[PDB]
Amino acid sequence: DKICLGHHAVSNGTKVNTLTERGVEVVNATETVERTNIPRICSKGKRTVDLGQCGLLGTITGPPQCDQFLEFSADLIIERREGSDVCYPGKFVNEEALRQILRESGGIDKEAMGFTYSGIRTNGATSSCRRSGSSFYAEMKWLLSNTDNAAFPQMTKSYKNTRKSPALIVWGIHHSVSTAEQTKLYGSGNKLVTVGSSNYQQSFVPSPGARTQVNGQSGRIDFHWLMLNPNDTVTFSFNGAFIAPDRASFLRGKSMGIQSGVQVDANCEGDCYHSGGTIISNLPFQNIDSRAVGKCPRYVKQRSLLLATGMKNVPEI
Amino acid sequence: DKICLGHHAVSNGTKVNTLTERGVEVVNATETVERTNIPRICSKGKRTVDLGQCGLLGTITGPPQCDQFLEFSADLIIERREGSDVCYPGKFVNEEALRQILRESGGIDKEAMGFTYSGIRTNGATSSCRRSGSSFYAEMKWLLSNTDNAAFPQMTKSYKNTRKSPALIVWGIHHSVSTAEQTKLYGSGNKLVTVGSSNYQQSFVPSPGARTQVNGQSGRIDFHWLMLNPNDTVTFSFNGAFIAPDRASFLRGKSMGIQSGVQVDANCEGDCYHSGGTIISNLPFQNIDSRAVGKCPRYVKQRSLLLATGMKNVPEI
Amino acid sequence: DKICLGHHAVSNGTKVNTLTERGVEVVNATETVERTNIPRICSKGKRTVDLGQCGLLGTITGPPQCDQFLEFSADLIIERREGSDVCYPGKFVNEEALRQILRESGGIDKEAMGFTYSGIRTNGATSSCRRSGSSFYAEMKWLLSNTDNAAFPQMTKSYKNTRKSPALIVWGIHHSVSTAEQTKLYGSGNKLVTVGSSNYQQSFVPSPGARTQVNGQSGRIDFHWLMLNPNDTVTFSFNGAFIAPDRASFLRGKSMGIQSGVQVDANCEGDCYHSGGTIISNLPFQNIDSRAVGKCPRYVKQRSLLLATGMKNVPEI
Amino acid sequence: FIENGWEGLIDGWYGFRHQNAQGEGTAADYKSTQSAIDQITGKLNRLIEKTNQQFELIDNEFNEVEKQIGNVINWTRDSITEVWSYNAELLVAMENQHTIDLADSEMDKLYERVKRQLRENAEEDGTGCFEIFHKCDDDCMASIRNNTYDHSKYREEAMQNR
Amino acid sequence: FIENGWEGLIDGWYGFRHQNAQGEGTAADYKSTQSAIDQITGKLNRLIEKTNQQFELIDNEFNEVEKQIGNVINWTRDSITEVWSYNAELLVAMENQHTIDLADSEMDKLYERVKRQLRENAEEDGTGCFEIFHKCDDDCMASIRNNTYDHSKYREEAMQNR
Amino acid sequence: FIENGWEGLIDGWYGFRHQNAQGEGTAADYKSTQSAIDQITGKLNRLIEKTNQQFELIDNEFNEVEKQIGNVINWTRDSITEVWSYNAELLVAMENQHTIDLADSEMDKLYERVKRQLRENAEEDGTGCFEIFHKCDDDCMASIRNNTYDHSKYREEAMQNR
Ligand SMILES: CC(=O)N[C@@H]1[C@@H](O)[C@H](O[C@@H]2O[C@H](CO)[C@H](O)[C@H](O[C@]3(C(=O)O)C[C@H](O)[C@@H](NC(C)=O)[C@H]([C@H](O)[C@H](O)CO)O3)[C@H]2O)[C@@H](CO)O[C@H]1O
Ligand SMILES: CC(=O)N[C@@H]1[C@@H](O)[C@H](O[C@@H]2O[C@H](CO)[C@H](O)[C@H](O[C@]3(C(=O)O)C[C@H](O)[C@@H](NC(C)=O)[C@H]([C@H](O)[C@H](O)CO)O3)[C@H]2O)[C@@H](CO)O[C@H]1O
Ligand SMILES: CC(=O)N[C@@H]1[C@@H](O)[C@H](O[C@@H]2O[C@H](CO)[C@H](O)[C@H](O[C@]3(C(=O)O)C[C@H](O)[C@@H](NC(C)=O)[C@H]([C@H](O)[C@H](O)CO)O3)[C@H]2O)[C@@H](CO)O[C@H]1O
Ligand SMILES: *[C@@H]1O[C@H](CO)[C@@H](O)[C@H](O)[C@H]1NC(C)=O
Ligand SMILES: *[C@@H]1O[C@H](CO)[C@@H](O)[C@H](O)[C@H]1NC(C)=O
Ligand SMILES: *[C@@H]1O[C@H](CO)[C@@H](O)[C@H](O)[C@H]1NC(C)=O
Ligand SMILES: *[C@@H]1O[C@H](CO)[C@@H](O)[C@H](O)[C@H]1NC(C)=O
Ligand SMILES: *[C@@H]1O[C@H](CO)[C@@H](O)[C@H](O)[C@H]1NC(C)=O
Ligand SMILES: *[C@@H]1O[C@H](CO)[C@@H](O)[C@H](O)[C@H]1NC(C)=O
């Protein structure tokens, strides 16, 4: 007579690593590092806007591509490689900070500033921003002299933020192709555009000169911005070469912005996004993209880390 | 006959977490995450200055609020929300870097630069900086023309740092309310203030224009600074719109600066500070303030992590 | 009769630390924190350049000290404390970013830009950059008027990057000792140097004035740079006070740059470098230099952490 | 068990395999199996937990950020990547060691349970079997399996045969 | 002990509880209790240690720093926060497992000590008790407790009664 | 072994030390020694591993970088330094505890192997020795050492002498 104790085993166990050995055979094991990617932007149940050809900063200035995005509202914002912040060539000082601001803004909310103008013109346009005919940024005003070579009266405009949240103010300096064209637009003399607030004091001057041929133009437009505190007032003192703001932008709520090149899919749900798709996983680690954003597992160098979920597999000799 | 072995237990054990279970009952346990805060700045045995209404940067320029802080000396520096670096409206370029410099400076030590002046005035004042009458920054000089609309002679001043530590130099550009006022102060023409040293070359120009009404004034004063190396010389070449430095600042030793809104308490001792008080704790972790500074336990998301200090509590059935 | 089991011991065991005790005696133990340093730059099998007296940025502009480094090629780049980027006094805007670019560039590759000039001079020199006689930066051109006080014709030059990698472009603004000298060189009037590309729009103006006496001169030269994309064109519009680029720099491959004060040793091999030598170690941690670069063990505060490689040492009573 | 596992035990982790007179039989022990399973699943539940912390963009793969802040960002991200790789590999290795060791400990618990359950009526062959020195039919084996074996019934006969 | 702890043992962690003829008695064992206590307090001393590293301000809650450097600072601080939260929870869990296991190991050490101390003069009932097959008054019990029990005195009588 | 190690055992970690009639002898056990050695060297190979991640300069000890970005860089580097110091000390401590415990476990494995190897022909003195109640010359001791001792040969005599 005899009774025996023992444990189970299989002819098909899996190798794992421990403190003392590399590659012991256990009965069962599971993966802890996620490598499966879903090549779509899983946006099921999320207010999503696909900026497409419209650059994120453009939504504040409003080039034609952003005409449908002047007052968007979203929980998830997607930037595309074909996007563009400008129609007339230019760029934003502190552009990436503004992008990071708008990505989590939940959308924007425009509001008229009420800038009335005296003895100038306010309908400056161009063929780089074509809306039917030669047009301009929908949220801006291209101010120049009345006729040609005429003087620009030294003007001062002010705007009080009568709301409870900071107001995104964006203006623009125009660098002409030459001092002759700068005179043709705003008159002779060195123009000065000073901007003031309760915590802002910068000042700007145009830089006429010859540049490349971006979008058909050799002139440029510097875009500048500042955040206005509640009950605070912005003051613009200018004498030419000034792209005046027509409407302020107020942040709606909160959101998250990603950059991607894959299509939107409202069928799957995901919180971890990267440019290649969505990481739908419950594993604690991932080896897909180190710059993944959202609520993600931690990125690790290793492609696989097998966690043992069974005992040691001693083969039946 | 029989002898038995066993262990203790209680009807009042505490739940902890392990590798294999969540919420097992052990006999005794202690907390590892600190949540108790002392709502005061425990400064027992520390040379402390409470800047109060005086902004930290003001101690270099010396507005009236900082008259008692022109040459302070401290181991712990406290900034207050009611502080202010300026009396006449203005701000510092690279202000937070200078704040982080002064917080660990152990205090400052002023020293006259010996700038003598020829055919101008050096007693420019204002009502925003009131010391009995209209006054100015105690460590600065407001240079303008002799009478009114008069010319400003192109001047050059130099200062050699005859000491063994870097000298904090701070000057100021004055942006007037208009070019007419800029002429009323320093004469016509575009003024230029160039500053040079052995590792510094910046240059500045005034920006006359209309701004808001901070402290009753629409003009501004840009405050700039640089660190001077031993045996190195600073050179100021100017022709108007210049707030000249009267005294240099030398760092005394080392210290640490915090921002808080609670009162000082010389009865308790603490090395871990935040804006809400002092974290007096020997625990390895804390869940009070992630931006706590000093010698602190590590901040963690969890409010509680019970460490078992006893065996498993099996109830007496 | 009797048979006994047991384990070994020694009269000379080593103390280690565990979870429950500090300083138990084990039979054998090994060190995990590396403190041994080799006070040389172990560069066996690596293409190394020792910049010596030549500053890293100088290799782009080419002061005399960098005449042998105009087109270097390396896997390991060593900066020296005696290095200098300039001969005529000046500095680089965004200098450390350019240094970090050149450290991992694998070397540089110059290429003529083909800038031809009309009615000016292109042989401006100085005694601070002495190559036999008064000379200048080997990769630059000092443009001024033909005779003296003569006008500078408003010029525009363009360069297309006809290659597949970004082209490092570097130009220079000249700040003279005075407006009188600025007129003596480039004529009267405020000069303007605008620079444009497909993603760059900056503009610059000279700052004449009196400064210190670095290398015998009181004037300065601001050095600016930009990276050119393939098939993109840079445009320089200038009217004086301009140090024009003669050759562009193209990055060769990849490398790594260190700063050190110890001599090169091609006898030992190492991947972990610091300013004091090379950390040749297989241990997981090090306590030599926290700013060590390369493929290093992790820096830790502790000088020693003994890992037990033997059993507990119970002395033979 | 000492150096062999039972590939035939396909309905449980641990179990009893006996032979007396009616032949050779094998059954699975539910208690120890469920204990080890509950511990391992405890580990799984601990290590699958979702992190509720959201991180957003700080650089840009369309328009490269400024070079200095970009190198600082890359430097920090690579440092944190090293930290999480170390934590991941160390975590998995430690948890694997503790898992194998806890399974072994459960086997020892079962074996010692049977040993004290049989008292002086059996001996240890040395390979995980209990030599019973008395007649033990299927009802006696099943009495050992369901933890109801009374050693007083066979004490005189077992010791007398030993 | 097998499935019950003694709430009456209020002067120690482990101990002996016997009954023979003079009644039922209970006392606490000092050696094992002091061993477990010393190990646990070793853990406490290890985990309370003060960090001597000072960190100062790098942002500003009165005047918000620039937005880009602020988002990089916040990003880094949140990353380090995740690291320290992981390290904290994992540390506490692991230390708890090792603590419970070390207490169990101490109990086993005491039990096996008594088992080898009694030799062949007793048997294991299976629930942490030693059935002594001879007269063992309070002096014999106290001889087991203070680790002075001589098995040769009762060997003939114990084996004869077994 | 219970409270003493053999400084004379200079050719192995564990081993047998006996005395019968021909004198007193000592030899080393190769199997357990090689097991513990292989585990410890496994730890060494795990912890020596080279990190293939390259980090380059982000500050400058010749020309100090700008003050704000410099304080952010220093702040981040000090944070990561704290993380790696914690990971280092905790790793070494945990690995030391597991090392000592695994050595003890190997000793227990050898001892229990001999215990089940001798069956009923010996008793446990309580200090790591097996009292054999029969004549056991050097061939019998060496039969225990090489794991070939047959307990049936001495069973009648051993039990009869016990
Ligand atoms: C193709 C080429 O290289 N030739 C350029 C030539 O383009 C350039 O003239 C500019 O050409 C563009 C189109 O290529 C436009 O026609 C420019 O005119 C407009 C515009 O539509 O943008 C006309 C418009 O009425 C103007 N608006 C206002 C408010 O003034 C603007 C404006 O003048 C400028 O955009 C501001 O810089 O321009 C036209 O100027 C010439 C110019 O020298 O150079 C050739 O080499
Ligand atoms: C209340 C309002 O909106 N009205 C402003 C009016 O304030 C402003 O004049 C300024 O008013 C302030 C007080 O509100 C001061 O009185 C200014 O004068 C002083 C000053 O004390 O600051 C006088 C002083 O002598 C001057 N010092 C020197 C060294 O020149 C300074 C100096 O001129 C300026 O501060 C530099 O910008 O000013 C007074 O100018 C007027 C101005 O247009 O605008 C009304 O709308
Ligand atoms: C020693 C002292 O303090 N005296 C200075 C005196 O140096 C300075 O004149 C400058 O002196 C330096 C040498 O110390 C050079 O001689 C300067 O002349 C040169 C140069 O070689 O750098 C001559 C050269 O032909 C010029 N090149 C061109 C292309 O124009 C340059 C050029 O003018 C300047 O470098 C540009 O700023 O200079 C010489 O000017 C005088 C000047 O006021 O001040 C004394 O105090
Ligand atoms: C292996 O483990 C995984 C995860 O714990 C589980 O889903 C799976 O069913 C297991 N396999 C077996 C055969 O039990
Ligand atoms: C529980 O543990 C804490 C800390 O280790 C200790 O101060 C306290 O006295 C313990 N409680 C008891 C009842 O021993
Ligand atoms: C102690 O350990 C080290 C590293 O594991 C080894 O090189 C050395 O030989 C060991 N010492 C002895 C005496 O075995
Ligand atoms: C940072 O890393 C990314 C890849 O992760 C790279 O594309 C980018 O150029 C790097 N930034 C630099 C080198 O400044
Ligand atoms: C960084 O976080 C703090 C809160 O911890 C917040 O107040 C601040 O606005 C954040 N910085 C940003 C959003 O730039
Ligand atoms: C950063 O730390 C280094 C030393 O590691 C120090 O030399 C440098 O000054 C620090 N940067 C500061 C204080 O801005």
Cβ–Cβ contact D51 with B under 8 A: no
Q: How far apart are CA B33 and CA B15, in angstroms?
A: 16
Indicate the DSSP class of residue B84: B
CA A103 – CA D54 distance, rounded (Å): 13
Task: Answer whether F57 contacts ligand 6 (Cβ < 6 A).
Answer: no
Q: Is A110 annotated as a binding residue?
A: yes
Distance from C-alpha of D30 to C-alpha of F114, rounded to nearest angstrom: 31
Of the partner residues A156, A194, A235, the one whose CB lies closest to the CB of residue B207: A194
β-strands B76-79, B256-259 pairing: parallel
CB atoms within 10 A of CB F143: 16
Residue B90's domain comprises 47-262
CA atoms within 13 A of residue F69's CA, in its CB half-sphere = 19
Phi, psi of C310 (to 5 degrees): -145, 175
Q: A251 φ, ψ to 5°?
A: -70, 135
CA–CA distance, C259 with C80 (Å, rounded to integer) = 6
Q: How far apart are the CA of B88 and the nearest CA of chain A, in angstroms?
A: 13
Nearest residue by C-alpha to atom 14 in ligand 3:
C216
Which tokens in the block code for residue C179?
């407006």
Calpha distance A168→F113 (Å, rounded) = 79
Which residue of F63, F71, F82 is in closest CB contact with B100?
Answer: F71
Q: Whose CA is nearest to atom 4 of ligand 9?
A: F74
* Domain edge (last residue) among C220, C237, C262: C262
Residue B195 to residues A205, B139, B221, C266, E27, Cα–Cα distance (Å): 21, 19, 16, 46, 87
* Contact (Cβ atoms closer than 8 angstroms) between residue B38 and residue B219: no
Say yes or no: F91 contacts chain E, CB-CB below 8 A.
Answer: no
Nearest by CB: B19 against D38, D53, D98: D98
Q: Retrieve residue C242's tokens.
A: 């301009």
Mutation pick from F63, F65, F71 vs chain B, by most beta carbons of B within 10 Å, is F71
Q: Are D29 and D14 in contact (CB under 8 A)?
A: yes
Residue closest by Cα to atom 10 of ligand 4 = A28
> Are residues B298 and B238 part of one domain?
no
Q: How far is the CA of A168 from the centre of ligand 6 (A)?
A: 67
Q: Tokens in use for A117?
A: 């103008």
Tell me how far CA of residue A109 lies from CA of A70, A165, A166, C191, D124, in angstroms. 8, 11, 12, 43, 82
| Probe residue for ligand 8, chosen from E64, E76, E78 as the CB with the greatest number of ligand atoms within 8 Å | E64
Residue A71 labeled ligand binder:
yes
Interface test with F, best of E35, E55, E150 (most F CBs within 10 A): E55
Question: Ligand 7 centre from D73 Cα, in Å?
Answer: 9
Cα distances (angstroms) measured from residue C267 to each of C40, C263, C273: 10, 12, 15
Domain regions of chain F by residue span: 1-162
- Tell me, using a 6 A CB cutoff, whether residue C114 lines ligand 3: no
Handedness of CA C160, C164, C166, C167 (dihedral sign): negative
Alpha carbon C147 to its chain centroid, in Å, reads 39
Q: How far is E151 from chain C (nearest CA, A)?
A: 18
Task: Supply the angle between the helices E67-118 and D67-118 in degrees, to the nearest 10.
Answer: 20
Q: Which chain F positions have a beta carbon within 8 Å of B298's beta carbon?
A: 82
Is the domain of B154 the same as that of B110?
yes
Verify that A150 and A195 share a domain, yes or no: yes
Do F16 and F26 contact (CB within 8 A), yes or no? yes
Which chain E residues touch D81 with a CB distance below 8 Å?
Answer: none
- Phi, psi values for residue C260, rounded to 5°: -150, 160
Q: Which residues contact B153 (CB under 8 A, 6 or more apart)?
A: B118, B119, B120, B239
Residue A168's alpha-carbon distances to A249, A250, E37, E65, in angstroms, are 5, 6, 63, 17
Provide the CATH topology of domain F1-162: Hemagglutinin Ectodomain; Chain B (3.90.20)
Each residue of A71-91: b (16+ CB within 10 Å) or e? bbebbbbbbbeebbbbbbbbb
Mutate to test the pocket of ligand 4, among A309, A311, A313 (most ligand atoms within 8 A of CB): A309
Q: Is ligand 2 within 6 A of the CB of residue B241?
A: no
Helical segments of B148-224, H only:
179-186
Rounded to whole angstroms, how far apart are CA atoms D87 and D85?
5
CA distances from C312 to A193, B268, E98 (A): 79, 45, 19
Chain E residues within 8 A of C18 when measuring between CB atoms: 42
F3 closest CA partner among C311, C317, E147: C317
Enter the resolution in angstroms.
2.7
Picking from D150, D114, D156, the residue whose alpha carbon sits closest to that of residue D134 is: D156
The whole-angstrom separation of Cα D67 and Cα B289 is: 32
Q: For residue E38, which residues of chain C lie inside 8 Å, CB to CB?
A: 20
CA–CA gap between residue A58 and residue A75 (Å, rounded): 19
Closest CA to A220 of A126, A293, A311: A126
Specify the experimental method: X-ray
CB of E73 sitting under 6 A from ligand 8: no
How far apart, in Å, are the Cα atoms of E65 and each of B55, B96, D126? Answer: 16, 7, 73
For D147, phi and psi rounded to 5 degrees? 60, 55
CATH number for the domain that contains residue A224: 3.90.209.20
Closest chain F residue to C1, measured at CA = F20
Q: Do residues B129 and B64 lie in contact, with contact meaning Cβ atoms separated by under 8 Å?
A: yes
What stretch of H or E contains B244? strand B242-245
Q: Percentage helix, strand, coil, to 5, in chain E?
A: 55, 10, 35
Q: Quick one: B23 exposed, middle or buried, by C-beta within 10 A (0-12, 13-18, 19+)?
A: exposed
Residues B275 and B252 in one domain: no
Q: Is the CB of residue B235 less than 8 Å from the CB of residue B196?
A: yes
CATH number, residue C315? 2.10.77.10
Q: State yes or no: B110 annotated in a binding site.
A: yes
Distance CA C54, CA C138 (A): 13
The beta-carbon neighbor of C233 closest among A190, A212, A220 is A212
- CB within 8 Å of C240: residues ≥ 6 apart: C143, C144, C145, C152, C182, C185, C186, C187, C191, C206
Residue A144: DSSP 8-state: B
Q: Does the C-beta of B178 come closer than 6 Å to ligand 2?
A: no
Q: Give me ligand 3 centre to Cα C176, in Å.
A: 10
Last residue of a domain, one of B262, B288, B306: B262
Same domain, A73 and A139: yes
Same domain, A180 and A142: yes
**Which residues neighbour D85 within 8 Å (Cβ) at sequence distance 6 or greater?**
A300, A301, A302
Q: Cβ contact (<8 Å) for F42 and A301?
A: no
* All residues at 6 or more sequence positions from A176 whose CB lies less than 8 Å from its CB, including other chains: A182, A185, A206, A208, A219, A241
Alpha-carbon C205 to chain mean position: 27
* Residues with Cβ within 8 Å of residue C93, at least 6 apart in sequence: C222, C223, C224, C225
Residue nearest to atom 29 of ligand 2 (CA): B124
Is residue D45 within 8 Å of B22, Cβ to Cβ? yes
| Residue C30 Cβ < 6 Å to ligand 6 | yes
Tally the C-alpha atoms within 13 A of residue D120's C-alpha that lie toward its C-beta.
19
Give yes or no: residues C296 and C163 share one domain.
no
Which residue's C-alpha comes closest to atom 9 of ligand 5?
B28
Q: Any idea what the Cα angle at residue C55 is, between residues C49 and C58, rounded to 5°?
A: 105
How far is E8 from E4, CA to CA, in rounded Å? 12
Number of domains in chain A: 2
The ligand minimizing its distance to the Cα of D12 is 4
B124 lines ligand 2 (CB under 6 A): yes
Question: Hey, which chains touch F, using 3+ CB pairs under 8 Å?
Answer: A, B, C, D, E
Whether F84 contacts chain E with CB within 8 A = no
CB atoms closer than 10 angstroms to residue B220 = 28
Residue C178: CB within 6 Å of ligand 6? no
**What CA–CA distance (Å, rounded) separates B140 from B60?**
9
Check pocket membership of E34 for ligand 8, CB cut-off 6 A. Answer: no
Same domain? For C65 and C187 the reply is yes
User: Can you tell me the distance from the alpha carbon of D43 to that of A307, in angstroms, rounded to the nearest whole number?
Assistant: 10
Out of C190, C196, C203, whose CB is closest to A212? C196
Residue C175 and residue C231 in one domain: yes
Using the atom order of ligand 9, give the atom closest to the CA of residue F59: 1
- Fill in the DSSP letter of residue B229: P
| Distance from C-alpha of B169 to C-alpha of B226, rounded to nearest angstrom | 5
Query: How many degrees, rounded to 5, is the angle at CA E124 between CA E120 and CA E126?
Result: 170
Q: At what angle do helices F67-118 and D67-118 cross, to 10 degrees?
A: 20
* DSSP, residue by residue, A120-133: SB----EEEEEESE
Find all residues with CB under 8 Å of E101, minimum gap 6, and list them. Answer: none
State the CB neighbour count (10 A cutoff) for residue F25.
15
CA separation, residue C132 to residues A141, C67, C129, C135, C136 (Å): 59, 13, 9, 8, 11
Partner-chain contact B300 E88, CB within 8 Å? yes
| Start-to-end CA span in chain B (Å) | 23
Q: Ligand 5: which residue has its CA nearest to atom 4?
A: B30
The answer to whether the beta carbons of residues C55 and C78 sit under 8 Å apart is: no
Q: Which ligand ends up closest to the CA of E72?
A: 8
Q: Are residues C237 and C144 in the same domain?
A: yes
The identity of residue B287, as a single letter, is N
B98 and B163 part of one domain:
yes
Contact B220 A192 (CB under 8 A): no
Q: What angle do CA C104, C301, F73 make, to 5 degrees?
A: 40
Per the listing, tokens 């101990």 go with E15
Number of H helices, E strands in chain A: 3, 29
| Same-domain pairing of C213 and C238 | yes
D72 CA to chain F: closest CA distance, Å?
Answer: 6
